[PDB]
């Protein structure tokens, strides 16, 4: 109990991530570093290339409803997060999705996104 | 003597997923041997309230695995994506259908974290209990 709970870290990151996704997706890049991987399909790496991928997807009035968040301590003082929720982009029907994050220490209890893996359900089943 | 590139995270993750769900069908009593101290595990479920809480450590994990009464558990994996992560570990995302005790197939969303098999984290949720 010498650091905030992984659940607090994970849940507040998810809050800020999907808020930024709706309000300024061109700012999402601040979460990523050199080693970061973004999957949303083939992976892209690094802030510049991740930013380019994010802006390619045209997140327009993206609205998210989080239905559950699991967040646990993982190796090397990281936090692994699994998000289940619904997402509406461009005012279309909400679609169920998975999102897996691995948060790595960036500082004092500060984290950056090392892995970001998103997948819609309907595309899979 | 020899030099060969390490296997891709996707090859490692896909083989782990195969072994995991093979053991879940054949001998769930040995699933716990993937986990160690400070491993986390949850497999869907609801409380009397709400999604059930995770447990930690091989021995509680074993007891929770046995609590699920995995019997004739059949799984069809529809999506697996694995990537290198911290300390050359592997993070694996899985979506598929699981039928336990000859019941109807249920969709699920799962995340694993594997050591650089050692499972650091096993996060499994049924979609029907969450959505
Ligand atoms: Na696949």
Curated annotation (Swiss-Prot), chain B:
There is a cross-link at residues 37, 50, 59, 64, 76 (Glycyl lysine isopeptide (Lys-Gly) (interchain with G-Cter in ubiquitin)). Changing residue 59 to R: In 10KR; abolished ubiquitination in response to heat shock, leading to decreased stress granule disassembly. In 6KR; strongly decreased ubiquitination in response to heat shock, leading to decreased stress granule disassembly. Changing residue 125 to I: Found in a patient with a neurodevelopmental disorder; uncertain significance; decreased function in stress granule formation shown by rescue assays in transfected G3BP1-deficient cells. The keyword ATP-binding applies. Changing residue 50 to R: In 10KR; abolished ubiquitination in response to heat shock, leading to decreased stress granule disassembly. In 6KR; strongly decreased ubiquitination in response to heat shock, leading to decreased stress granule disassembly. Keywords: Acetylation, ATP-binding, Cytoplasm, DNA-binding, Endonuclease, Helicase, Host-virus interaction, Hydrolase, Immunity, Innate immunity, Isopeptide bond, Methylation, Nuclease, Nucleotide-binding, Nucleus, Phosphoprotein, RNA-binding, Transport, Ubl conjugation. It is found in: Cytoplasm, Cytosol; Perikaryon; Cytoplasm, Stress granule; Nucleus. Phosphorylation of the acidic disordered region regulates stress granule assembly. Dephosphorylation after HRAS activation is required for stress granule assembly. GO terms for cellular component: cytoplasm; cytoplasmic stress granule; cytosol; focal adhesion; nucleus; perikaryon. Homodimer and oligomer. Component of a TAU mRNP complex, at least composed of IGF2BP1, ELAVL4 and G3BP1. Binds to the SH3 domain of Ras GTPase-activating protein (RASA1) in proliferating cells. No interaction in quiescent cells. Interacts (via NTF2 domain) with USP10; inhibiting stress granule formation by lowering G3BP1 valence. Interacts (via NTF2 domain) with CAPRIN1; promoting stress granule formation by lowering the saturation-concentration of G3BP1. Interacts (via NTF2 domain) with UBAP2L; promoting stress granule formation. Associates (via RG-rich region) with 40S ribosome subunits. Can mediate both protein-protein and protein-RNA interactions via the NTF2 domain and RNA-binding domain RRM; protein-protein and protein-RNA interactions are essential for undergoing liquid-liquid phase separation (LLPS). Protein involved in various processes, such as stress granule formation and innate immunity. Plays an essential role in stress granule formation. Stress granules are membraneless compartments that store mRNAs and proteins, such as stalled translation pre-initiation complexes, in response to stress. Promotes formation of stress granules phase-separated membraneless compartment by undergoing liquid-liquid phase separation (LLPS) upon unfolded RNA-binding: functions as a molecular switch that triggers RNA-dependent LLPS in response to a rise in intracellular free RNA concentrations. This is Ras GTPase-activating protein-binding protein 1. The lineage of its organism: Eukaryota, Metazoa, Chordata, Craniata, Vertebrata.
């Amino acid at each position: 109990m010498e650091k905030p709970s992984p659940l607090l870290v994970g849940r507040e990151f998810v809050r800020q991530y999907y808020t930024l996704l709706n309000q300024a997706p061109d700012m999402l890049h601040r979460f990523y570093g050199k080693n970061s991987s973004y999957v949303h399909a083939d992976a892209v790496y690094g802030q510049k290339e991740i930013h380019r991928k994010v802006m390619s997807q045209n997140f327009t009035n993206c609205h998210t409803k989080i239905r559950h968040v699991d967040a646990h301590a993982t190796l090397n003082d990281g936090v692994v997060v699994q998000v289940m929720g619904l997402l509406s982009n461009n005012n279309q029907a909400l679609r169920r999705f998975m999102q897996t994050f691995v948060l790595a220490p960036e500082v004092a209890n500060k984290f950056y996104v090392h892995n970001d893996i998103f997948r819609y359900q309907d595309e899979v089943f």
